[PDB]
Amino acid sequence: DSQKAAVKAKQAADAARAAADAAQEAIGSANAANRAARRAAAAAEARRHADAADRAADRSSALAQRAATAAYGARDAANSAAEHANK
C-alpha cells in the first residue's frame, strides 16, 4: 500500500505537472490572442487562439480532476497502510 501510494502520488504529480503545462498552453494562446487583437485594433486569428486556450483549459481541468483522483487513491492507500501498521 505504501508502494501503491507512491505510484498514485506519482500519477497525481504527473497529472499535476501536465495541468501546469496545460495552463502554459492556455496562457501562450491567450498571449497570442492579445497580440492578434492588438494587430486588429487578425480577428479570425484571435478567435482561433481563444478556442485553443479554451481547449487547453479543458485539458487542464481534466488533468486536475485526474490529479485529485490519483491523490485520493494515494490517500486511501496511505490510510490502508496506516491501518495495516496499526494491526
Binding site: 492556455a26 491567450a30 490572442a33 486556450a53
Partner: peptide, 9 residues
C-alpha cells in the same frame, strides 16, 4: 482564466 482572457481578446 487565460481562456476567458483570450476570448475577451
Amino acid at each position: 482564466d487565460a481562456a476567458d482572457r483570450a476570448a475577451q481578446d
